[PDB]
Design a protein around this ligand. Structure first.
Ligand SMILES: [Cl-]
Ligand SMILES: [Cl-]
Ligand SMILES: [Cl-]
Ligand SMILES: [Cl-]
Ligand SMILES: [Cl-]
Ligand SMILES: [Cl-]
Ligand SMILES: [Cl-]
Ligand SMILES: [Cl-]
Lengths: 395, 395, 395, 395
């Protein structure tokens, strides 16, 4: 069969826009993909139109052949926006190929190496311990979650003395352990807001006695070598990588021993084609994979197949299709809710795992094209915090 | 004054599209910038619209404050397309600030450290020596060029035995030295088409006895460390960096001793704000700067000011506004010509240098808005070559 | 315009001599600079006379061109005294260039990236905690300081058992935390008095639990590599660099991971021309800048502009123009006071920050030439302490 | 005995100024020293006055005690000018101590380890081979020289294609070997005029087949690590160090394998006190010492004693007291002559060696105070060459 159409849907996932892509073939199949939402999503359709020129008329079962063509035609390494678009097209090609062979996508990735996919709940704020307990328990009662991710920050880190900022985080984690179920796993996402390796190490070591599931992305991404310096003398599990794009950025991170766990995003790195290479590198370095995934239900389905096939996969970030809207940080459980409807039958957790759908080819979800047509673009941007002297810090 | 409008012009530079950007202020000034042409230029206006939301109402003389805001709001490191747009906006801010202070832009960069800016002619093909001589001599007679850049490739590198490919390049360079003026400088751009460090070293060492001005970008960009391996035992000047984006990618390149000369592009890295940081790093490592610049006359003007202010600047890539259209490689002097008209009064070489315009504020060029309106977008894409087995290689 | 006169003022800043320099132009402008006081200040006028030979008749807006000429003419790297003189001349050139363009100096440095400049109070002694509290509170009431720097040394380090020396420092810091406001930041300057890296690490780790804002310059400067050894296994923020002179000494320090925060002095390194290069290197290594500044009000004004323009600037050392005379160490708040009068309208702190003067060109201060004429040279020298065996140790 | 007076003589050595220093004691002895001529020699007397405050009343036989005091009192590492003054005072202390004990200075340095001190003639220009032959032969006939140092540069290195510059140097050295006596040793001083390590390596390897005695100081001094990169793959003996100041700069150079031979200057590094430490470090790294010495006859006498006592000393730079005035580079044997008279009885070569004076205490020369009074200061400065684009390069 040959690729003969692309359809691009500008829709949304609660309060973030989302571009969803279909590739159709002359045998009547369709494969689906999800772009990351970097910010200016209206840039994605023209990128996709340009990339489609290299896919028209081609055999979609030549997945790596075509994805590599998309990478090579730019010559320059594609960045955030380009790779987001490439990611969605990679997803479409895997989905088409699996549908053509009448198998779940994981059968094209070496097969399932596990029966279900562990998830943690993206909570993302820093609520007081009793409120955290109640929310964790609610999530456990509904979906079986026993792993959760919070922000460590209990004050504005630029408006208080650093020792007090760190003590507030340590006291907070202590409180959580005194309050919530002993078996619950709690990760902290520092969200790339720390400048100095030494400061990141101090915070990590203050959290360490209370067993963070992982300590995610404390520093900025551009200098990879400094991650190796951070991790020397760090007593907790260090996770990073969500902001890295390709096999070679991850290779450098691994070579400097800059992470214990890596967190590539399958909508950011160029899809499964690149995600698999990244995970293979990590595996040889004895580093696990916890995919970054604040994206929507189609991205989640793509993650389910990658995660099911990858030996060194450990746990998957998960946001409920009906639930909390965008947030990072703050003293509350986020009040804003939304409902993401572009997947008819999203993967939902059972006992804190997503279960495979072995009798369904492709991703194992159906798309709701009417819902995508009903809900269009919405503007979304990050707030970059400021210091008291008026300078900008880090999102 | 405050920024109060952005105007975006989709135009062209011969057979490549070009997005040109104006930022206007409430005091009636306008600053101008040029985006790189990565490929899908129709992605640039929506990126620019999104970025402009962070610039509206701001003081354009706070250049680094605003450019850093544009970088930070994405959180992820911006890639090719995002940084292209950021580059043009950086240019606009320098131009506005210089116009506001009634000075040439170089006076905002520590002042001029040279009186004129050496250029080489972007010829880019591999014509037989007599034809090369005639073209070099024509360029010398008209503009005073004594430095030129060619492709080293005289055959399809994937369809002939490697030893013969390299011998053809060495024999070609020998012929050029037997044929053209003794004082002429000749650089070779291998255009990221070699996979293996050892192969890149073999070619460089075969060219070395004939004194290449530099040997540019033989390998792919993603693995930076391998450039240090290449350069160990390399007997000619090695240049790279055109495909690197930020201060930290260049820092890594410098740390591994992966280049003797770096070639960032002021329309790719985020403009002068980033270019200056990159050049400063290179300076401390005793590495010079030869900016990459196959772009148009506004990009050239931006380069003139950066180059005039930068101690470790050596030579600037230059394409004539009226002249040869796009080409890389091949046995001919390119037949296709074009005329780029969006700058009224482009910098032209005299004795092989661009001369400063000290009595004119800003970039020292006027824009032709009617010409930009007359000539719109044109589709352009790279050819990715194939090997005889049907696989894709490297653009 | 052209430089057409230099005027050199031998004056004083309380009990230290100070050489202040003016460069005049044939358009009637004057730019001002401040030399560091290394010791033999009577050496500075003849150095300045010699350097002026390279500046006479030149365009002062070619700042880096001229400063680099001053550096290159010596061939040998200039040391302390030479660079002190070069620093003042750099300041004069920035001031002239900014006055010529009718802008604050920061507009020549990429613009302001913050609205105000955080300062800490140079207290420098080791008073008992109640007296420290009272002095901190006085400084807070008057000027809004919430950050302070002390000496850690509570006894003669060469006349007591080392474990007891360190315990005295740790007990002192504990006392301070039990006594003074919880939000106060306290830095310790060990003043290059420790010989052995291991000893410096022991003291730093003893201070660490009480959150020193930074631990400054424990070791001597000549061996840069040993700073990387010190910092391995160090649990507090390490600051150094005040005794380093150029981009390459700082590059080495950064490469060995020998500091978390660097403290170049804008009157020591060759002025803004060099300070900016140093800060750029530190930025790429994710290291902040806390400029060293025990100098006077003109030096402070130069620092305000550099600090306002530098993203990775964190905090600025500050001495009040009317206040405490020279001191390092000891059990008292220094009794000797003085008044520095050569700047008419010095920057004073408000809420612990220096505020910009956006409507004033140049440094934004006026000079008092009569005050400089009234108060001349005074001899000043350091005491080099001795050990009980009669040997000399380290100032 | 106690130091009770310092006398400072501003004199000259042909066309360069020279500061000569005497320290007198209350037993009626006098020791003598020579400052390097960095440039602004009028800075030296005030530095010396300040330093003398630490020497007055002291026992001059406590040489290292006092020299280290002079170093420590500045706290900051002393630079060029400060160390020049310290050097002369170190010389005075060795001379006093040796006179007090009635021995030659070398008996205070572990004794003579050789009977005579090999010298090479500082010719410094690049005369055509027949003229070089005639000058070498003249020098051999008069003084027995068989070792000579030239500049390698036969054209303006910034105004000609680099391959042609290097070929001119190689062709020149070939010519010299075809023309002059087979036993003559010829060193080349590239005088810190090359920016790029790769370029320095290319020139060194082009000279290498003709056996340069050493290839001196091709690169700039500030980045020490790059010297290790240069020397990797270099086929000739590499010498540097004249522009380095202390034991730790030399330690770094040695650690990176950045030289085969080091060239500290006993008037630059702080005298014998520091020179001995430097040489000891080099010895352990199996690196020899060829002291830099374009200074005058007192500096030469100081060098004779250091060189006589130092196992890893190889050869000493030498300028005749009556002979060629200042020059570096150029196509001629320098026409300007002068006569340096402040030493009554300078060391002159015999068979190309300086001979010891074992029956004379101290340096073994007498000073001519009347000659110093007759010939005063003269202004001297370096020319910094320019490139054709108007930028400044390197002296
Ligand atoms: Cl449960
Ligand atoms: Cl729910
Ligand atoms: Cl010509
Ligand atoms: Cl033409
Ligand atoms: Cl307060
Ligand atoms: Cl006060
Ligand atoms: Cl002989
Ligand atoms: Cl003679």
């Amino acid at each position: 069969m040959k690729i003969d159409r692309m359809r691009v849907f500008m829709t949304r996932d609660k309060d973030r826009p989302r571009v969803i892509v279909a590739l159709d073939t002359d045998d009547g199949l369709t494969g689906w993909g999800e772009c990351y939402n970097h910010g200016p999503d209206k840039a994605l359709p023209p990128i996709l139109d340009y990339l489609y020129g290299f896919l028209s008329g081609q055999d979609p079962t030549r997945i790596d052949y075509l994805v590599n063509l998309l990478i090579q035609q730019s010559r320059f390494p594609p960045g955030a926006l380009g790779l987001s678009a490439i990611s969605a097209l990679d997803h479409c090609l895997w989905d088409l190929s699996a549908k053509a062979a009448n198998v779940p996508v994981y059968k094209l990735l070496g097969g399932a190496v596990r029966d279900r996919v562990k998830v943690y709940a993206g909570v993302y704020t820093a609520p007081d311990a009793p409120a955290a307990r109640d929310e964790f328990d609610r999530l456990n009662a509904e979906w079986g979650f026993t792993a959760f991710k919070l922000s460590p920050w209990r004050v504005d880190i630029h408006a208080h003395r650093w020792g007090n900022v760190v003590k507030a985080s340590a006291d907070y984690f202590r409180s959580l352990r005194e309050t919530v179920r002993d078996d619950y796993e709690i990760a902290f996402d520092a969200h790339a807001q720390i400048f100095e390796p030494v400061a990141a190490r101090q915070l990590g070591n203050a959290l360490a006695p209370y067993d963070p599931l992982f300590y995610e992305e404390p520093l900025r991404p551009e200098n990879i070598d400094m991650w190796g310096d951070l991790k020397q003398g760090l007593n907790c599990v260090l996770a990073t990588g969500e902001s890295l794009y390709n096999r070679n950025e991850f290779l450098r991170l691994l070579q400097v021993k800059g992470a214990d766990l890596i967190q590539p995003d399958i909508c950011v790195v160029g899809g499964i084609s690149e995600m698999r290479r990244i995970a293979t590198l990590a595996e040889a370095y004895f580093v696990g994979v916890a995919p970054h995934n604040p994206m929507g239900p189609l991205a989640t389905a793509v993650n389910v197949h990658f995660s099911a096939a990858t030996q060194n996969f450990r746990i998957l970030e998960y946001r409920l299709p009906k639930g909390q809207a965008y947030v990072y940080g703050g003293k509350d459980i986020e009040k804003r809710q939304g409902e993401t409807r572009y997947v008819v039958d999203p993967y939902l957790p059972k006992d804190g795992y997503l279960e495979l759908r072995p009798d369904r080819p492709g991703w194992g979800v159906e798309m709701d094209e009417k819902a995508m047509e009903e809900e269009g673009y919405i503007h979304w941007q990050r707030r970059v915090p400021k210091r008291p002297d008026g300078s900008y810090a880090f999102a």
